[PDB]
Design an enzyme around this catalytic site. Structure first.
Site, PDB file in Angstrom:
ATOM      1  CD  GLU B 142      -3.031   0.074  -0.167  1.00  0.00           C
ATOM      2  OE1 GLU B 142      -3.154   1.311  -0.059  1.00  0.00           O
ATOM      3  OE2 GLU B 142      -3.493  -0.582  -1.124  1.00  0.00           O
ATOM      4  CG  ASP B 168     -17.927   6.684  12.406  1.00  0.00           C
ATOM      5  OD1 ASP B 168     -17.797   7.627  13.212  1.00  0.00           O
ATOM      6  OD2 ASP B 168     -17.647   6.782  11.194  1.00  0.00           O
TER       7      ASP B 168
END
EC number: 3.1.3.-
Lengths: 243, 243
Positions: B142, B168
Site C-alpha cells: 500500500e 463510528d
C-alpha cells in the site's frame, strides 16, 4: 505597468486562547492553472518551462486538463460567469496550441509526465479600487465582497497603514493594508462561504481565523510571505490593547 | 463490522536541521463528497442532516454537484477507472434521488444554501489487506502503491507495531502501522505524484515530509489526530538512532 491593490487586515482577540488572530482567505485555484487557461505561456518555450507550470497546478486541475474539455476547465475558474468573448478567444488559443496540431497528444504527454503539485495560497483579502474610490472605502468594500463581513462587525484603526511593493519583471505591484479590530462576535467566518454568493466563492475556497503561529506555518510553505504584513499589524494590536 | 487498514510510517532524519520527519499524504477529495457520490446518506433526512454533509465538502466539490452532471462528479473521484457496474448503481440512485422528482431543483437549492467548506485530511498511507496477505506485506504494498517509494529506499524496523481503534457506532476501524527508516535520500517525495501513476493520484493531492511541529499543527486543525501515532514512532526512531 503598475497594479495597486488595497486590503484590510481584520483581527480578533480570541477570548479562549488570549491570542490575536486575523482573517485570511485560501484561494480556490492555483495561479498556474489560471495562467494556462488564459494562455499566458509560450508554446515555443520548450518543454521544461511549460512543465514547471504544469508542476505548479494541483492534481485535480491536471486531471481537468487531461479531459481536453476546455469548457470544464473554464467552468472551474469562472463558474458560468458571463465572459463569452474572453472565453472564445482563450478557447481558440487553447485548441490552436493543443488540439489542432495533434488532438491533444503532446498536451496529454506533458500532463502525464508533470510531477508534484502546487499549493493554494492563503492571502489577505484585497482588490483594485474602483473609479476615483478612496483607499479605505475600497478596502472595506472588497473585504465585504470577499468575506461577506460587513462594517458592522469591526472598527477601523486609522493610524495603521502598511504598503508593500513587489516587482514581477514589467508589472510593479503595490499592496496597501489598513487594520481593523473585531467589535462584534464572529466565531465561524467560513460559514459566510456559500455558492449563493457568487463573488465570495469566485476565488475563495476557505475563510479562517489564523493566529501568528498559523501565519508563520503557512508562510514557510507557500510563495506568498504573510509574516512581514501580519507582524506589524499584530504589533499595533498589542500596543492598542495595552492602552 | 470491523474494517482493518495497515499502513507504513516512513521516517527520515533531516541532515540539515536534525529533525525527524515522516511521510504524510493529503487526500484529494473530502469524505463528504465520496459519501454523497456513493449514496451513503438518507434522502428522507430532515434538511440539516444533508446540510452537514454538503457543508463538509469543498467549494469545488459543491460546484461540481451544482452542474447536475453525475459523470463529472464521478470523474472527480474515479478518473475514468472502468467500474461501470458500481457507476450504474450509484448513477441510478442519484437519478432517483435528485433528477427524476424535479430535474435537480431541490438538489440545487440544497447545494446553494450549504455554508462553509470541509478540510482535506493529512494521513499516513494505509489500505485494506488482500486475502491471505500478511500485515507487513500489505503495509509495504500500500505504501508503494500510494507514494511510489519502493523498498530500496527504506529499512523496516520490525519491532514497532502500533494499533489504533475507532468506533463510528456500528463500524469499527482498526489501523495498524509499521515503522520504516529511510535508507536512501529522497528530498522531494511530492515529485512521485504524476498522472501517469493512477494509483498515486487516485486519492492523493500531495505527498510531504512532516516534522513533529508540523504534525501537531495539522493534528490540531483536523478531525484526524496524528500525534498519538507519530509521537511513539519518532520516540522509537530516536531510541534507534542514539544507539
Amino acid at each position: 505597468q503598475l497594479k495597486t491593490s488595497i486590503g484590510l487586515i481584520t483581527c480578533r482577540m480570541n477570548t479562549q486562547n488570549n491570542q490575536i488572530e486575523t482573517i485570511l482567505v485560501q484561494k480556490r485555484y492555483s495561479l498556474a492553472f489560471s495562467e494556462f487557461i488564459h494562455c499566458h505561456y509560450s508554446i515555443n518555450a520548450n518543454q521544461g518551462h511549460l512543465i514547471k507550470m504544469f508542476n505548479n497546478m494541483t492534481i485535480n486541475e491536471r486531471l481537468l486538463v487531461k479531459t481536453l474539455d476546455f469548457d470544464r476547465m473554464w467552468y472551474h475558474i469562472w463558474i458560468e460567469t458571463p465572459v463569452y468573448e474572453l472565453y472564445h478567444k482563450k478557447y481558440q488559443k487553447f485548441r490552436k496550441n493543443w488540439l489542432l496540431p495533434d488532438n491533444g497528444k503532446k498536451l496529454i504527454s506533458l500532463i502525464n509526465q508533470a510531477k508534484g503539485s502546487g499549493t493554494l495560497l492563503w492571502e489577505i483579502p484585497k482588490g483594485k479600487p474602483k473609479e476615483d474610490e478612496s483607499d479605505l472605502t475600497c478596502a472595506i468594500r472588497e473585504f465585504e465582497e470577499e468575506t461577506g463581513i460587513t462594517r458592522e462587525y469591526y472598527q477601523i484603526l486609522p493610524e495603521f497603514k502598511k504598503s508593500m511593493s513587489y516587482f514581477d519583471g514589467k508589472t510593479e505591484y503595490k499592496h496597501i493594508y489598513f487594520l481593523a479590530m473585531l467589535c462584534k462576535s464572529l466565531e465561524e467566518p467560513n460559514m459566510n462561504l456559500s455558492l449563493q454568493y457568487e463573488n465570495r466563492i469566485a476565488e475563495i475556497s476557505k475563510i479562517s481565523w489564523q493566529n501568528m503561529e498559523a501565519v508563520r506555518f503557512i508562510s514557510k510553505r507557500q510563495s506568498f510571505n504573510l509574516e512581514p504584513m501580519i507582524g506589524p499589524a499584530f504589533n499595533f494590536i498589542k500596543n492598542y490593547l495595552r492602552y
